[PDB]
Write a protein that binds this ligand. Structure first.
Ligand SMILES: O=C(O)C(c1ccccc1)c1ccccc1
Length: 167
């Protein structure tokens, strides 16, 4: 049993809810929250800017030190950093950004990072300002992630479309 409430069950391991990932993290304090990161860990907009704002910029300060030491992530890659006030850990995952021309085949590699964690609160990778089709992102998630993933979909209209169209 876990703390996640109000989710629709899609498969054995994937759950979905219309919720603001920030407000959900604040309520649950999950072991792992996933950030929709870029390779520079520059949290300016979308899930990254919102999560980072909720940490009072502490996520960005930690991230800048990580990049200064290690250099940029790979598209499809990840790193584990603090969850600050939102979670124990933040798994920063880089999905391909279609609005930068990145290979959508890298979305499966991105979701494979989730398999290193038994339970996660996450957004749909490469959705929103990353430009991918969220229906596609949900299909790759279901077909790739084997651990227990709780997906937060901010947009109520998109959420209802994801549920209604789910095979
Ligand atoms: O739902 C998400 O995953 C994102 C998103 C995507 C598309 C439209 C609105 C919001 C998101 C961005 C910022 C904060 C929370 C959620």
């Amino acid at each position: 049993v876990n703390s996640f409430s109000g989710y629709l069950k899609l498969t054995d391991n994937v759950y979905i809810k219309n919720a603001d990932i920030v407000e959900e993290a604040k309520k649950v304090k999950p072991t792992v929250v996933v950030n929709a990161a870029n390779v520079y860990l520059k949290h300016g907009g979308g899930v990254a800017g919102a999560l980072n704002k909720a940490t009072n910029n502490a996520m960005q300060v930690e991230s800048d030190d990580y990049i200064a030491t290690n250099g940029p992530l790979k598209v499809g890659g990840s790193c584990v950093l603090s969850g600050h006030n939102l979670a124990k850990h933040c798994l920063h995952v880089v999905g391909p950004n279609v609005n930068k021309g990145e290979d959508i085949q890298l979305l499966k590699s991105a979701y494979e990072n989730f398999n290193q964690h038994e339970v996660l609160l996450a957004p749909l990778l490469s959705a929103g300002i990353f430009g991918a089709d969220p229906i596609h992102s949900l299909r790759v998630c279901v077909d790739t992630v084997r651990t227990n993933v709780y997906l937060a979909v901010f947009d109520k209209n998109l959420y209802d479309k994801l549920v209604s169209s789910f095979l």
